A paper describes a structure:
Intracellular leucine aminopeptidases (PepA) are metalloproteases from the family M17. These enzymes catalyze peptide bond cleavage, removing N-terminal residues from peptide and protein substrates, with consequences for protein homeostasis and quality control. Here, we dissected the catalytic and chemical mechanisms of PaPepA: a leucine aminopeptidase from Pseudomonas aeruginosa. Solved structures reveal the presence of a PaPepA hexamer, which displays high similarity with E. coli, bovine lens, and P. putida PepA hexamers (RMSD between 0.4 and 0.5 in comparison to PaPepA).
Mn2+ was pentacoordinated in unliganded enzyme and hexacoordinated when bound to bestatin, but distances from coordinating residues remained the same, showing little to no distortion in the metal binding site and coordinating residues brought upon by ligand binding. CheckmyMetal57 revealed that the metal binding sites for PaPepA are optimal for Mn2+. If the metal is replaced by Zn2+, a large RMSD of observed geometry angles (ligand–metal–ligand angles) compared to ideal geometry is seen, further arguing against Zn2+ as a viable metal. RMSD between apo and bestatin-bound PaPepA is 0.21 Å, and the RMSD between the apo structure and Mn2+ bound PaPepA is 0.21 Å. Analysis of tunnels and cavities in PaPepA using Caver34 revealed six possible tunnels leading to a central catalytic chamber, with three separate paths linking the protein active sites and metal binding centers to the protein surface. In our structures, tunnels contain a narrow portion closer to the active site (3.5 Å diameter on average at their narrowest part), therefore, excluding the possibility of an extensively folded peptide or protein acting as a substrate. Additionally, the location of tunnels highlights the presence of one viable path for peptide binding per PaPepA in the interface between two monomers. Manganese-dependent enzymes with binuclear binding sites, such as PaPepA, coordinate a water molecule between the two manganese atoms.
Author numbering:
A (entry chain A), B (entry chain F), C (entry chain C), D (entry chain B): 18 to 516
The structure:
């Protein structure tokens, strides 16, 4: 959006650091770890004297804010509860970080220093903790207000310092730098997802890609229009697009950070900038949330943004299949049969199963790059939400080594996915009496049969499919909006592939 | 519809009046009233002799038709029951009058004389009873047969005489003249509402206003097109119209019957020629009645027609926001954010809440006339039918004096409205995380939330809002069609303001 | 598809006929019939000996396939069970024929000889049986695979011989010749119905009619476009078409096989190439089956094709009213009022009752031919499926003799219809307060009131109406697709009218 | 629940008062008020020095918590923002009070003192501000946890002191005493509403009434079982109950606090302890919220509990009509006709319109008390939520003075209602061809026709009807549960009647 937050790692003593706010952890009910103890001592016991009064039980995320304490160079000391466990899990760690950030946002302090190195998080060393902490803090600063007449008061907080021991400082620094690049990527993804569909159409996304190439000389962009798509034979891509006044776009991103002889990784993103269902029209209730139907393509933008900042030694291709799905006098009809670019014919039984019809033509297009892996990302099926809910993405693929790599990256990022099977027995649900493939398989196993459909275009390479219909946005409440998932998972996968 | 039926007030004796039909009231179980007693005596008791056979019980609206009676100059005598009550209520008086017109319409009499001045109506004097009676009779003669190949046989009845004492004659005459103007306006409103949506589109309504100016030289008319609406920055209005092939129109009516120093009264009407719901498409059952979605604009035409006939000493402005809500490949999508003329940003969560989107821009435009009152009329919410039904109109406003003036006028006209609260606690339902206002507030308090939306565009003037979704038309049966409401309330309001 | 199967009638001894497969009937628990006995004796009881081992119970359609048997010139003998009754019904006869064909299809034999003359069929002589047997066999060979990349293996089976006694062969061969012409017409009807709606639009059907005229020089074709339809005043036909990008067509077919002084029979076909419902949009589930909403017109194609092959001495006219029904910003709205060719005005309460709106203008057009009968065929109401299911067509009409003729033809063809009454009491369900006719009559008696609507345009001639909404296609499963009904009923009607 | 928080009014100086937490208001960008300035002065400018740092913007409900300040006897000072307005609205005042309570709840302080006398609340003097403030604080302490295995930690906070000038202290004292009685009644109401329906059945409510009579010697209780209801002839009440295994109860409460010659006020409460809808079964989703269908009766409990605490000089009668609405083999069927106690026959078209069927027999029973007002309270129609939402109760009545008294009471209580009209034109929606009254009037004006039905049993006295379907509970979120409305309105009505 703008960003700006400076994240610094320092190895200095907390009790003499000049800062507007020093942040210390307090266990249930006091316990005081090493850093907090040293600060207490420096004040002559004022902190333990306050805690003894009992206002802070020490549960995860509780807070107690003190002003000037004797002999400290911190204008304020913020105590945050760390619970009673010796180690926190990932969810408690994030909750603790978010409670700290929420307090700091309301203060007029220009910086804060985090003396949180004494916290233990299950399975996480210094680098893995920094990645989680900094990503939560940086992504927590996200603001989208460009159509609000009354904008939010700018934050006074402009700097966050992570205190670490000198032996850990290099690991914390590296984790912080990667986390910032990921958060910057998610901010781009969230902006693209949150924009209204009358602004964020396929032509607009083409221009956004060209702008990203202006910012990053390492990025090459090409944008194909409908004439080029028809030349290439993308009959099912064009079938989705034809009902709309807005022309479709295929956006190609290319980054060559490795040797010319290294096979590229390809990211394929579903970019339906608004999904009405078409002639198979959706119900009205909640259909404004279909502006998030391009979050797949948005996450390819976000991942490129993070990789371009980090300058990873990999070769990366992004393919964004962008169209708007509208009803009209020239829209695709249920029962239409079209010829995909692969040559397979498809009977379009349901015009609201349109994401797989733009992706399948992009998966055929991807063959030309001779890729060592191909991952498509798409807000594809409501069935995935029934299967896995809103906090775990659906994952399928035709190569188990690649599926394993993506699961592992999702566990490290705390951006988790879960595999569903593409057993051959499911494929017959896509049989059509009239064409090579039907575009829907009926009410059983909807997420899997959608993956089975895509698999038929991905046989020439190692391929996986992330269904992010549940994880790409929040539906309601104060926090309705795009999430930026799965940029953390995708970037961590590429970070490992780059070693 | 031409009408052209003559209403006369006379003070002559009923029993020597030459007429095709003389109409007398007969009470239930009490003595003939003064007039009927005199006619009975004139005939030598022939009427009381017939009534003694017991065919006419005297219940409200029952009738007995007699041919020629001794010593009378009426070719026929129509007896109509008046009930047992000393005073009739408004509904009973209307029912009595409709029973009389029904019988007269089936007769070959060219004229009829009504001797009903002995009837008492609760809270109603001579002028008030005449307003109700003449309005009922004139509007009951309304006929719409434009698209019928077999048109109705013309009525022989062409003159109706109201017999009144010389002391009440002036008041009865003033009531008849005002009631006739109201019924003429109602006939224009009913015609415009009953017209098919393929004929009555926004361009047609602009040509009808130009015709009203050719008939009334005191009326000035300006019709603005989409290009001018864009110069004015009316984004909400243009968003509702973009999906249709039919161009939008803002019709401006201006009548100056008072001095240039008198601030104008502004009437703003919803002119949605047809409401399909848009991308948020409505179900098909009953969608034909969405041709009555321009009855608010039609009510402004009708009130102007009544005021132009009565030449009232007032300055009146009419703003008719006209558009057609249609599904298309260029139609507004749920989630679109638009900038209103006021600069306020609006997130259109539901394309079927488009009436408020054409009215908000019209209310902003109304500010230029420095109005002393601004009243919007719209078939806005079906929640108003759940709240107040089809007999009472919803009324909301930012000024208690204007709301009370409109409620008193509705009580005088027997075209009643009812106030619903615009408490500030309802406004939060229109909160959007992406814009200044959401166009919908949820399943609770729909009528109030629509008024709260319009209130954000009416803060610079005294404003009121009439929801006529349930009162502007009858859904089915043999009397399916436009009602002409709320022209009676609006003309009574303007008559009180002209004094 | 291309057909090609040769049907021959021969009167030779079954046991010396050289054939790839000789087909014999075996009764359940009764002795072999005359033909089967003679073949068994020719083998020395080989067939008796096999049947004694009990593998073939002889239930209708059971089979037992033998290779080479002593002293026969058939490479194979196929035994098919014929049940235990002395006569078969039409359903069992068809079952038997289909089981035989299914076995032959899977064999590598180039021909087969059917020694089935012994079978008896309730109420069917030699000609009636041959009509049923050959039509079932020929139509059973239909294949639609033009959008399958992997096409079916061509059959080895190219010739079928019917063995008949010399006394019967003349009737058998006439039944066979008629059955083949009917099957060829069905194949054309089935192809046109099975084509996807993005290919088979009204312009495509027009070109298909021109192609049929190049094939049969006796056929004259004229294709009218939108401009000519507007010249003719076809307002309700045009209202259906106006929402779509695809222009409408009225296709006129004329065949004069009789003297010029003899009045023609007219077939009027509903050619809605896809039915979305329009603004009154259908639900998405199963909407792909609306490509069959032109099977009415397709059956007129197929009837002409069979009549042209047979060169019947009749004068025959076909009118195919073709349009596509889509939602758009210019589509017809519920509540629109239009003027039909006939001058009657119609209120379009429901844009999904569109078939009768193109048919009524075609019925008026048909007056110019001064016909002696007019039959319209249409997939008109889902209510007919509720009434009569998927195996009996609904039949209505204004002439009792014509209705009787069609029922009798249906019984003979085993393609049955059933009459529903058009009692004048139903007509008032189509009363509109605004026009001469409403296009729908509510939820009661939906098939009948659609018939009553059409009857108002057919008063000048003898007319009947076939509602084939249930019989024109099979909805799901392996055999999903067009049926070709009612070509067999219609052709049998013309055959009888030609005598 | 237990309650028992001590509320005291004192007139001492805030700056020398010994307290665990002193609470002061801070304006947004205006000077500290008198109290707050006195305290700042006594600390030598410590509070103003902190505020200059800028952490507390001063918006309504923002907080800043300080520890020991120099020269104060307060262990802690809580600063709470009061906005920038000179006067607060009721909503802002409650929000401010709730933010203070939320902070105190989390502290270990045993008491707190509130120096908020400088706050102006629009339209409210000392007594009216105290009523609102103390009711918000006391009701905000409510806890319901009897089926949770993990109970909430008891609060340390046990005493709240309101600081007031000696000139206002008597009025603040009186408001505080009334507010705590109202809050105690709401706690009983909320407990009864929150109990699960397998515990809180009609018999249980009867025993609860007896327990209330043990606690308050002024209260007399009578509990009638199904035998007694039938002897009284309450066929409509019994019709609702018969489908359930739980027997019904009519509970009569009587309190005689005035001279025996004062006519009583009667409160009639709908106590449907669970509403399945019966044979007219409700949908499954959200049906758990039908345990709140006895909140009408619970509010009569709560109002008595407050009146008995205050010992008001009034005569008060309570009638709780309690039944459970279940489907079974003996349940009332749609179309049953029953004879009410009044003798009017009712045709039960919908067994889910059951509240009015138990209330109507209670309204007839109420005649024996010769009351000067009768008020029924019922979670009656979901249509009320459509008309007025979740924050305003619907109000209807046969006496304009009584209706105005209740509206005024609700405005003072900030527990508002809104009148809907019972025009005679609505009554005909209850016409039945088979009985004196139908129990439903169709989809229009559902709240009004329900009031119309009840009005037919209330003609012998001044009567009003509160529809609390939207205000009696909260549906979801953290705060799902009964609200205790309209106990504040009813108690304020009784307070004014007792002067
Ligand atoms: Mn979709
Ligand atoms: Mn989609
Ligand atoms: Mn609408
Ligand atoms: Mn509308
Ligand atoms: Mn249709
Ligand atoms: Mn159709
Ligand atoms: Mn109920
Ligand atoms: Mn209930
Ligand atoms: N402090
Ligand atoms: N955790
Ligand atoms: N693989
Ligand atoms: N990883
Ligand atoms: N996202
Ligand atoms: N309107
Ligand atoms: N059969
Ligand atoms: N022709
Ligand atoms: N026949
Ligand atoms: N029917
Ligand atoms: N009855
Ligand atoms: Na989707």
């Amino acid at each position: 959006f703008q960003g700006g937050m400076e994240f610094l790692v320092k190895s200095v003593r907390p009790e003499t650091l000049k800062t507007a706010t020093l942040v210390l952890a307090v266990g249930e009910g006091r316990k005081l770890g090493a850093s907090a103890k040293a600060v207490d001592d420096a004040t002559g016991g004022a902190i333990s004297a306050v805690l003894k009064r009992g206002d802070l039980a020490g549960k995860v995320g509780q807070t107690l804010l003190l002003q000037s304490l004797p002999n400290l160079k911190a204008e304020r000391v913020l105590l945050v509860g760390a619970g009673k466990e010796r180690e926190l899990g990932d969810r408690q760690y994030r909750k603790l970080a978010s409670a700290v950030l929420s307090t700091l946002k309301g203060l007029a302090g220009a910086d804060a220093a985090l003396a949180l190195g004494d916290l233990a998080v299950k399975g996480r060393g210094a680098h893995a903790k920094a990645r989680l902490l900094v990503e939560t803090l940086a992504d927590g600063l996200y603001v989208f207000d460009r159509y609000k007449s009354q904008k939010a008061e700018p934050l006074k907080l402009k700097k966050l310092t992570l205190l670490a021991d000198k032996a850990d400082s290099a690991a914390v620094e590296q984790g912080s730098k990667e986390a910032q690049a990921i958060a910057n990527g998610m901010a781009l993804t969230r902006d693209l997802g949150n924009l209204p569909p009358n602004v964020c159409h396929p032509t607009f996304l083409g221009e956004q890609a060209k702008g990203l190439a202006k910012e990053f000389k390492s990025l090459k962009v090409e944008v194909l229009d409908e004439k080029k798509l028809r030349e290439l034979g993308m009959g099912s891509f064009l079938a989705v697009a034809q009902g709309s006044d807005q022309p479709p776009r295929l956006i190609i991103l290319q980054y060559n950070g490795a040797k010319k002889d290294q096979a590229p990784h390809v990211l394929v993103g579903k970019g339906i900038t608004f999904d009405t269902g078409g002639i198979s029209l959706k119900p009205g209730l909640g259909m404004d949330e279909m502006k998030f139907d391009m979050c797949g393509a948005a996450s390819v933008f976000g991942t490129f943004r993070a990789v371009l900042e980090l300058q990873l030694p990999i070769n990366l291709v992004g393919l964004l299949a962008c169209a708007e799905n509208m009803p009209s006098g020239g829209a695709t009809r249920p029962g239409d049969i079209v010829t995909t670019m692969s040559g397979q014919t498809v009977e379009i039984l349901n015009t609201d199963a349109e994401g797989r019809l733009v992706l399948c033509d992009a998966l055929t297009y991807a063959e030309r790059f001779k890729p060592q892996s191909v991952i498509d990302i798409a807000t594809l099926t409501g069935a995935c939400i029934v299967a896995l809910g809103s906090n775990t993405s659906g994952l399928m693929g035709n190569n188990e080594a690649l599926v394993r790599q993506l699961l592992k990256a999702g566990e490290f990022a705390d951006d988790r996915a879960w595999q569903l099977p593409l057993f051959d027995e499911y494929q017959e649900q896509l049989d059509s009496p009239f064409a090579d493939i039907a575009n829907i398989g009926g009410p059983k196993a909807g997420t899997i049969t959608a993956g089975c459909f895509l698999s038929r275009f991905a046989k020439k390479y190692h391929w996986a499919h992330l269904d992010i219909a549940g994880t790409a946005w929040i539906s309601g409440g104060k926090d309705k909006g795009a999430t930026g998932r799965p940029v953390p998972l995708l970037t961590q996968y590429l970070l490992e592939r780059a070693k």
